Design a protein around this ligand. Sequence first.
Ligand code: HEM
Ligand code: HEM
Ligand code: HEM
Ligand code: HEM
Ligand SMILES: CCCCC[C@H]1C(=O)O[C@@H](C)[C@H](NC(=O)c2cccc(NC=O)c2O)C(=O)O[C@H](C)[C@@H]1OC(=O)CC(C)C
Ligand SMILES: CCCCC[C@H]1C(=O)O[C@@H](C)[C@H](NC(=O)c2cccc(NC=O)c2O)C(=O)O[C@H](C)[C@@H]1OC(=O)CC(C)C
Lengths: 49, 108, 379, 78, 100, 98, 59, 241, 66
Amino acid sequence: SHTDIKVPNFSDYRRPPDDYSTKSSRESDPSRKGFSYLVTAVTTLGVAY
Amino acid sequence: APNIRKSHPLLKMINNSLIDLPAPSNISAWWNFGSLLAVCLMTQILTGLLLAMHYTADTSLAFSSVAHTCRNVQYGWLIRNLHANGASFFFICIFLHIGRGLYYGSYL
Amino acid sequence: APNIRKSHPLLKMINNSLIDLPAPSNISAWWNFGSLLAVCLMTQILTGLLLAMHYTADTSLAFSSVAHTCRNVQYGWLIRNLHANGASFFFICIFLHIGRGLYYGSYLYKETWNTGVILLLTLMATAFVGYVLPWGQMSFWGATVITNLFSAIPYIGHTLVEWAWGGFSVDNPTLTRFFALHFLLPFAIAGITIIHLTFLHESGSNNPLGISSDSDKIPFHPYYSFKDILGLTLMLTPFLTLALFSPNLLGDPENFTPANPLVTPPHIKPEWYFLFAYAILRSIPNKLGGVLALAASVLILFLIPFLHKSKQRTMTFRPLSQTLFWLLVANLLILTWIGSQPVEHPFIIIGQMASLSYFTILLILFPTIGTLENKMLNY
Amino acid sequence: RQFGHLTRVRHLITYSLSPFEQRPFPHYFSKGVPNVWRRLRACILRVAPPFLAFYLLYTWGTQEFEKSKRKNPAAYVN
Amino acid sequence: SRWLEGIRKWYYNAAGFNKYGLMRDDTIYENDDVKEAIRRLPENLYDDRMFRIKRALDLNMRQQILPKEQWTKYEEDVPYLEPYLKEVIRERKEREEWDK
Amino acid sequence: AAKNVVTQFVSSMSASADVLAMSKIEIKLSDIPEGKNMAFKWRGKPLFVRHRTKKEIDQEAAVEVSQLRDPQHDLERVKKPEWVILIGVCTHLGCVPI
Amino acid sequence: TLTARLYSLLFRRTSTFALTIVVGALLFERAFDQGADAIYEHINEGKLWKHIKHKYENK
Amino acid sequence: SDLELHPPSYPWSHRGPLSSLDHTSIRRGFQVYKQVCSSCHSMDYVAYRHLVGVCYTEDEAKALAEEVEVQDGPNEDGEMFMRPGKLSDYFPKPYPNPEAARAANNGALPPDLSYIVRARHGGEDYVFSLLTGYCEPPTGVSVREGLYFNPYFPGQAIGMAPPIYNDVLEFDDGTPATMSQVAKDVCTFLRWAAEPEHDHRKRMGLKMLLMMGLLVPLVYYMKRHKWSVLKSRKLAYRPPK
Amino acid sequence: LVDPLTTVREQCEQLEKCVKARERLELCDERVSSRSQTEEDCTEELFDFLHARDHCVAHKLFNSLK
Ligand code: HEM
Ligand code: HEM
Ligand code: HEM
Ligand code: HEM
Ligand SMILES: CCCCC[C@H]1C(=O)O[C@@H](C)[C@H](NC(=O)c2cccc(NC=O)c2O)C(=O)O[C@H](C)[C@@H]1OC(=O)CC(C)C
Ligand SMILES: CCCCC[C@H]1C(=O)O[C@@H](C)[C@H](NC(=O)c2cccc(NC=O)c2O)C(=O)O[C@H](C)[C@@H]1OC(=O)CC(C)C
């Protein structure tokens, strides 16, 4: 049917060790984005130069 | 499409800007100015491209070069003449083209 | 449309060729080659346009001018370096781009492919000129053969040349009229390239498996835009490395000696990105044959689409033709070596040989190993 | 060709995670590097051969040439 | 002396298109004939093929393949389209001949 | 109209209305001893003037004229066999023979 | 906690982000150069004119 | 016989993709050119102007260029006239024209050494060798009247007599003016001469390399960051039955 | 004043290869200057020497130069 459907396990498979249930994904990633962004922020920077 | 004049990426453009293009029935000469402007753009690019075949951009040679390009190159003189004048026919048409456009509010 | 990215005649084009363009999900680097080719077209047009700001097309001033453009103009030296090398990064990417296309039968998008050839041809053409410009020993003598190379065409030949270049011998005129072509041509490449992509878009981009991709296809922007910016920096680093560390690494030094109409350098090795066909030309002793060989040496790409027999598009599942392929890519890397090599028995033969496998591998082997593999599948 | 007119696709459930909720890095040393080799070793025996062959034909060719240059101690023993 | 049978088996695993997990026919370039062929396919097999292709693509796009297990075995490869495709072709060849 | 405009803007290149005729040059034959070849600056392309040896002249005659690409005996191409003169321009694609 | 402090304050508002790219670039420049220049020069002690400028300006 | 000898590689002080030119050495390299080569070897693409800030001082080069008079523009009565070489003049030509030089150098044409280093495969390595490397032709081999054997030169017969021996000059800095030594200094010069950008060009290369290093990964993350949406992804075919 | 070159060519002229070469030459030399009519030339042999000599000449020469 459709109830029989699940989002498979992406845990270790991918997922940063700040994401493995039992605790808000929020508060956590609103830190992670900084990083991935940090890079970009930098690349942009490096590029400017 | 059995058409082709419409089923070909390139070919369509043409049969869509020169053939099949809907244009108002009533249109004065003041509408040619533009198609002319093109012909200038061409006549200029063609002649000048060809005149550059003999130009020598450099103070000491620059002036003469042209003279040479005229006196020495077959019809080189004709090329120049045509060029310097296309310049004008070019500005003329442009000046008229702007006219027309101004007084038919094509500027809309 | 509240969109705008789609409601604006100009603006749409962009958000229709860089954003929103459906591209296959699975695409190897061999797909960047092209976006790169562009960057070359640019780097070339930008630098050269800028280098022309100092060039002085005229025998007596031509050589020096460049030197001046280097020694005198701030970073003028950098500009040159970059330019002469873009030439290569340009031919490299093109040479790879053609590779990829060949071995994924992208040549099935025919038009997009045929236009491609034209580009090559032109890129080969424009690069021929321009190199004449600095008017070095090479510049000159290249001008004299390549041009004279049209000697072969009967009736209209001897004449077409004594016109090709200025009067009756590569001299000042030929130079000025070359600069012009060079200054002009690139802009043609740019145009055709537009025509090239147009034809493409008509038919989505290929994809390495050679099977429909509608099943997947991702929005060009988010993905491939980045992927290009990346590949930009990747095959940008080498090209720059060269230009800042060993510029003339690829550039024959013999050309550092101003032209002498009287003495062609013993050891005239054409530019690397030309050697293959070069070899082919000399290994077929007959003016005409020599030229003819050459003619088809490159003008053969036009036939690849007709010399396709595999029931499958790409050849990732065609291990047979697959190695035949590298037999080709190497058979090319060979012709090249044999091109940068003087004419003696150790070579020569090797030459005309590879300069035989070349054709056959294309004209015959491929299509044969082609149908064959289909039958090894009951097709 | 644009989007929404590509293919009649039925019954394909796909699950993907935001890039910020997953890690781009990825899993090198687990699936990463392994597959790399899974490939060097897969095509090495299909690519390298011809290149190798060239090499030989290159060396051979060069040596021989460099040889045909040196004198035959016996082109004149007298 | 050497079985074409024995051979095909070779080529099949050699082509290794089954490593992605898609039948022979799932590969044949899509030309006019095939398209018409596939357009004649029963909806069952169609969606089947689709997914197999999308999966194939998804793999390919990840550079990774299918576990040694899931590869499809030569003898079990299902020529799901060859039959339709053939009629097609002859249908055509029949027409092409009649128009002369 | 076109026919001409074309012809016109086609000769707007061929030739150049600038032609010379230095067809006349004086050479001190003693500048070229036996066995060597001197090159001269002549009419837009090089000019070869050579002093041939007894042997040189001898083998050039012993040449298998019938088996030649461009059959011509040495003696029908030069007046004084000890003296051979040529346009230092290769016929293939225009380089200077060494 | 840097990264978090950063995001919230610097990378969140597309308005801000940019602003740090700029002020950042200015800093990266100034620093990258001095660093580069030094790395370079040092790898060439006593060879540069800056280094011999002195036998007509001492050292 | 197209038989030739290929020049051995010397660890020049400036070979390193990151190593500039020993400006001190060029200074001498200059002097050796000025004092011994600039009497046969023209060097049209350089000019005292350059030396300033690279191996000489403004006042140094100025007085350095005074050292030569140059033919200059028309009078009022219009006539070439000589006058003190300014700072902007180009290194003096030894001969009014080539064929003039050829008539001064036993029928040979001493090539201009502006781009010599990069006009001959081998550059300095070649040039150096060539200079420091003459000798008696082995047997059976005979160089004709006016030429001088030098194995490293194609034909082995050069029209240039060994132009450099010990002491030929005296580097005012107190440097053993040995052949090997001077000949070195001439080559390091011939290099800068051929491409003044050298240093500026490598330094640049340095930075260029530190940006690739820094930029490419950054965008690589970004490329992966963005693709993870797909790399991660998972399919599944769920028909009803 | 002594040229570090000549000194370093002294040492080098002694390395095994030079000797095994310098010899190879010496013979040829007096092998050709011993006959009246011979096309042989001891160039090749000469190079082999040089080639080898200067090779180390380089590995060390620039050490004594300023
Ligand atoms: C001064 C230190 C000096 C250098 C350096 C030098 C070098 C040099 C080169 C590299 C060449 C030849 C390269 C080639 O393969 O053709 C060259 C050529 C000639 N030179 Fe020289 N030379 C130096 C000094 C001098 C001096 C003072 C004279 C005049 C006495 C002189 C002359 C010539 C001549 C002649 C040649 C011709 C070579 C030929 O065509 O055979 N050089 N020099
Ligand atoms: C857009 C149209 C063009 C304009 C408005 C134009 C106008 C001019 C003008 C007025 C001059 C000076 C002519 C004179 O002395 O009277 C000129 C000169 C020249 N133009 Fe153009 N030009 C145009 C395009 C071109 C093109 C496309 C080329 C080649 C790329 C070109 C190459 C030259 C050359 C060779 C000269 C120098 C010789 C001469 O002065 O006649 N021109 N052009
Ligand atoms: C399509 C790409 C281009 C190619 C393939 C190309 C290639 C070349 C090449 C190889 C040379 C010789 C460089 C050398 O001496 O090593 C050259 C020279 C030159 N090119 Fe281009 N060029 C291109 C575009 C341009 C453009 C767009 C212009 C300007 C319209 C330009 C202007 C020049 C100039 C000024 C020279 C002379 C100075 C020099 O030799 O470096 N080039 N070009
Ligand atoms: C003028 C320079 C050229 C540029 C800038 C250019 C650009 C493009 C680009 C970006 C694409 C998109 C997909 C890809 O990157 O591979 C493309 C595709 C293609 N180009 Fe070019 N191209 C050029 C020259 C050529 C040449 C010389 C050939 C001729 C053999 C060629 C053949 C193709 C083919 C077969 C495709 C379509 C199939 C596919 O993308 O998988 N292109 N080209
Ligand atoms: C391969 C050839 C493709 C054809 C390109 C060519 C094409 O637009 O051709 C016409 C339609 C164009 N004018 C008109 O359509 C037009 C429109 C309304 C009324 C009239 N007549 C008045 O009574 C017109 O004449 C005219 O102005 O030329 C342009 C502008 C263009 O060409 C220019 O880019 C060329 C420049 C870029 C060199
Ligand atoms: C105002 C700017 C408009 C943008 C023009 C610009 C536009 O087509 O930009 C991309 C899409 C084009 N390549 C691709 O789309 C592309 C397609 C499939 C895969 C990849 N990536 C591989 O992984 C691609 O990168 C790339 O090859 O540049 C062309 C060709 C054109 O630009 C050229 O005319 C410029 C020349 C004429 C000077």
